Amino acid sequence: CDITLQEIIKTLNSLTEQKTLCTELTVTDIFAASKNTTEKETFCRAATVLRQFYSHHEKDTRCLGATAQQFHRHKQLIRFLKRLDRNLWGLAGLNSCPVKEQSTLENFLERLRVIMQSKWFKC
Amino acid sequence: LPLPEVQCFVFNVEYMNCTWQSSSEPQNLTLHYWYKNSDVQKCSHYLFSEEITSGCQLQKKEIHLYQTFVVQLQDPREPRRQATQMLKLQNLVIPWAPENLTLHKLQLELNWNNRFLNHCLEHLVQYRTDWDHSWTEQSVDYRHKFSLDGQKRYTFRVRSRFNPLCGSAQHWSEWSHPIHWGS
Numbered sequence: 212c213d214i215t216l217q218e219i220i221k222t223l224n225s226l227t228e229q230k231t232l233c234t235e236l237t238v239t240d241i242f243a244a245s246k247n248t249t250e251k252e253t254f255c256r257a258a259t260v261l262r263q264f265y266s267h268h269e270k271d272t273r274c275l276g277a278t279a280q281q282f283h284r285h286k287q288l289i290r291f292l293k294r295l296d297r298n299l300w301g302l303a304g305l306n307s308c309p310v311k312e313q314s315t316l317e318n319f320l321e322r323l324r325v326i327m328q329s330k331w332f333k334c
Numbered sequence: 335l336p337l338p339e340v341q342c343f344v345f346n347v348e349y350m351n352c353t354w355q356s357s358s359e360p361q362n363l364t365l366h367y368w369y370k371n372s373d374v375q376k377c378s379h380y381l382f383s384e385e386i387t388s389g390c391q392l393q394k395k396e397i398h399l400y401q402t403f404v405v406q407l408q409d410p411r412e413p414r415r416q417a418t419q420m421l422k423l424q425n426l427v428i429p430w431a432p433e434n435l436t437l438h439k440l441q442l443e444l445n446w447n448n449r450f451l452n453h454c455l456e457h458l459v460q461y462r463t464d465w466d467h468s469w470t471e472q473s474v475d476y477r478h479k480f481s482l483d484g485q486k487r488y489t490f491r492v493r494s495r496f497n498p499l500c501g502s503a504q505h506w507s508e509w510s511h512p513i514h515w516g517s
């Protein structure tokens with residue numbers, strides 16, 4: 212029941228409230244694909260996908276709008292996504308879990324935030 | 335069919351950006367607006383994303399809060415393809431990040447300012463020392479005054495929101511440039 216857990220929930224909370232242009236872009240859904248997979252594996256696989264997303268879409272122009280605020284919104288998105296990638300990776304403590312091979316980013320996050328809230332609820 | 339949705343925000347009641355996602359579409363779109371229950375016009379300032387309309391901008395003279403605001407997007411080739419939207423602009427306000435941060439001992443007091451938005455705004459202040467892992471955030475009234483070691487190095491920052499008094503707006507302004515103290 213780490214402080215990280217809290218931060219991960221806060222970051223997810225912060226991510227869900229305001230939607231971006233990128234949030235509709237797809238990412239592999241690892242929750243329905245779970246076969247006897249351990250919590251660590253999930254956290255790891257969750258992080259893995261996010262890492263792949265923000266590395267791919269960081270420079271994406273669709274995600275960067277014309278407005279100065281659309282730029283700012285996206286900038287905090289990548290920032291937060293990176294934050295989660297590190298926090299989630301550390302919780303799993305696995306050296307890697309390639310997910311290979313979909314879901315809406317915002318839907319994925321919404322599902323993830325639910326797990327964390329149930330985890331934090333537990334402890 | 336169908337049309338994209340328009341995102342309208344009023345920035346510290348100076349100008350208003352009205353945008354939409356042009357990127358999702360098969361292939362210049364027209365925008366008109368009017369105020370319901372008042373005494374239709376064309377957008378005088380067009381924002382272009384890739385030489386096709388990104389959105390529109392309304393200057394202060396054209397902006398009226400507490401007056402029902404209505405917008406109509408339309409397609410030049412297929413005029414019968416169009417959409418209308420009604421907005422509460424007092425809920426759409428997003429103030430600039432607080433400026434002119436100041437600190438003086440007395441018992442430390444922090445101060446920031448805005449242009450004529452001071453009575454509408456609601457603030458949240460964050461602070462930490464070199465000895466702190468986490469940001470300590472403290473909500474503030476529209477009064478905008480905060481109170482509280484030279485061995486510890488202090489860092490303050492704050493943002494504001496248009497709420498509740500002048501409006502119900504959800505979104506927070508960006509974080510003000512951090513102010514420092516100590517060591």
Ligand SMILES: *[C@@H]1O[C@H](CO)[C@@H](O[C@@H]2O[C@H](CO)[C@@H](O)[C@H](O)[C@H]2NC(C)=O)[C@H](O)[C@H]1NC(C)=O
Pocket residue numbers: 277278279280281345351381391
């Ligand atoms: C609102 O509308 C205007 C017009 O798009 C925005 O100003 C643009 O700001 C970015 C800054 O990088 C650049 O595209 C140009 O400076 C402006 N547009 C041009 C000339 O192409 C402004 O940033 C928006 N206000 C917000 C959302 O805060």
Ligand SMILES: *[C@@H]1O[C@H](CO)[C@@H](O)[C@H](O)[C@H]1NC(C)=O
Pocket residue numbers: 362385386
């Ligand atoms: C849209 O309008 C602008 C300004 O009038 C013009 O420069 C541009 O060529 C137009 N693009 C089209 C026809 O989609």
